[PDB]
Design a protein around this ligand. Sequence first.
Ligand SMILES: C[C@@H]1O[C@@H](O[C@H]2[C@H](O)[C@@H](O)[C@@H](O)O[C@@H]2C(=O)O)[C@H](O)[C@H](O)[C@H]1O
Ligand SMILES: C[C@@H]1O[C@@H](O[C@H]2[C@H](O)[C@@H](O)[C@H](O)O[C@@H]2C(=O)O)[C@H](O)[C@H](O)[C@H]1O
Ligand SMILES: *[C@@H]1O[C@H](CO)[C@@H](O)[C@H](O)[C@H]1NC(C)=O
Ligand SMILES: *[C@@H]1O[C@H](CO)[C@@H](O)[C@H](O)[C@H]1NC(C)=O
Ligand SMILES: *[C@H]1O[C@H](CO)[C@@H](O)[C@H](O)[C@@H]1O
Length: 457
Amino acid sequence: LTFNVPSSPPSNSSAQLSDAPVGVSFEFFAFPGYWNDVPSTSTCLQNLKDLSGTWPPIRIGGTTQDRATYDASSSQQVTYTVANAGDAPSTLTFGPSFMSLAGTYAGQVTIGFNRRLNNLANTVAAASKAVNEINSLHAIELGNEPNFFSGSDPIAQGSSWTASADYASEVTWQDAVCGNLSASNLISAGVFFGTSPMSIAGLTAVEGQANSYVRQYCSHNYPQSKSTANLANLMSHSGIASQIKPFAKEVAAALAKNKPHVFGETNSATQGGGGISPTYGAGLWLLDYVMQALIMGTETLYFHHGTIGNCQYCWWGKYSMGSPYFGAYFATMALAGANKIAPLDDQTTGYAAYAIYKDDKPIRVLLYNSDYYTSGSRPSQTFTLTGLSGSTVSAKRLTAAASTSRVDAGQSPTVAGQTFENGSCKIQGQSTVESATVSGGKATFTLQASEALLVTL
Ligand SMILES: C[C@@H]1O[C@@H](O[C@H]2[C@H](O)[C@@H](O)[C@@H](O)O[C@@H]2C(=O)O)[C@H](O)[C@H](O)[C@H]1O
Ligand SMILES: C[C@@H]1O[C@@H](O[C@H]2[C@H](O)[C@@H](O)[C@H](O)O[C@@H]2C(=O)O)[C@H](O)[C@H](O)[C@H]1O
Ligand SMILES: *[C@@H]1O[C@H](CO)[C@@H](O)[C@H](O)[C@H]1NC(C)=O
Ligand SMILES: *[C@@H]1O[C@H](CO)[C@@H](O)[C@H](O)[C@H]1NC(C)=O
Ligand SMILES: *[C@H]1O[C@H](CO)[C@@H](O)[C@H](O)[C@@H]1O
């Protein structure tokens, strides 16, 4: 395997990147718990800001945003009952202090409010409070995954809930919210799970002048369920290229409206994740997915964090770190301060190489070996880079014992030999940097199955 590193961005490069493409989504009812009850939240976010110079953007939403009513006279951030701490509530209220708490975050904040219950005046009042309380407010969603609403939901108003019904609903709600707030460029529109039966392509065709009310168009993506869980398939480099392809039309539809696309809620697998979601391989999926989604043209990805103590795809909890945090950390490291990324491979194999540009000059190369590995002799692949300078380059390696390695089982992955403390997210260990010879502008690297390597030029 040999890849030429071009001296300026290739034609199949990404567009200019955001300052911090890797963000975090927090299930709406659990957001105060993440801030108040989970010590690792602050440090895990600070660790990423320390790499990029920008707070990861955050989003607060999910199914529970459509179970929630704003209570302007509540002094509580969030009020609900569950039978077990592991359950999500069937209903909840949130006070104005919920938005104030989100307003303590310095990074860009997206907040999702309720459209399913058709409480339009209540959602307008929550939106007004969000604008007042959240200085770094990026966007407001009006409903989460309206593709899953039914004729039984208040928003359907006793008629069938079709794609056309939702698009018409979104324009009406965008008009009422922006009209009441005298605002524009505010709504995170669509918020669809996948691309059928509702699509950004379909919504943008109907938006017309209400496009002016839209900040961004939003997709959700979860490649697998508990029932289709297959870690080798999830993390496969060529598999990821196939998996994201339906969203290419969604990105194109948003960008034709001069509005960004985001994956405003995404993670490995649904119902909070399956046996594959806490693995090292799910962190490698996350790493490679981020790179491919940004080249496709999405602006930002927000990885979902669900019920505290019952969340398989979470990067951290109250007590343990999760292997997937290593993918988010490495992706953030790879992209830090970069303007563009370009795929050097053709995405037909398990092996990836990306050139990473700053000021139109190559600064880093990210290599990825997506081969699934659990037992026996671990295979490896050599990667040759051409077109380089000097007599030597440096590299940092992401590795673990197996594709299935879990931090909570004691098999943490390492990022240049470092790990993150259980219960705090503090960085731990001695960093180790590798070096390689450059002769005649070529250097060779070896990646075992299920590894990634960030080469600094
Ligand atoms: C799946 C895992 O859940 C959370 O970690 C658990 C861990 O599995 C358990 O053994 C114990 O240590 O409690 C922690 C916790 O609740 O923090 C955590 O969300 C982690 O990121 C996940 O991978
Ligand atoms: C209530 C919530 O349910 C799951 O999270 C959902 C998420 O709310 C939804 O927007 C997305 O399509 O699917 C997620 C998923 O199935 O994982 C999780 O079980 C959460 O932990 C829980 O809080
Ligand atoms: C404001 O919101 C209400 C819904 O509570 C709606 O009836 C009204 O038309 C909206 N006003 C403007 C100016 O958009
Ligand atoms: C990107 O373009 C390069 C040539 O500049 C090519 O070798 C590579 O296969 C392309 N990758 C993709 C995924 O289009
Ligand atoms: C990666 O390391 C292998 C040894 O396993 C070499 O063949 C290669 O040239 C590079 O140093």
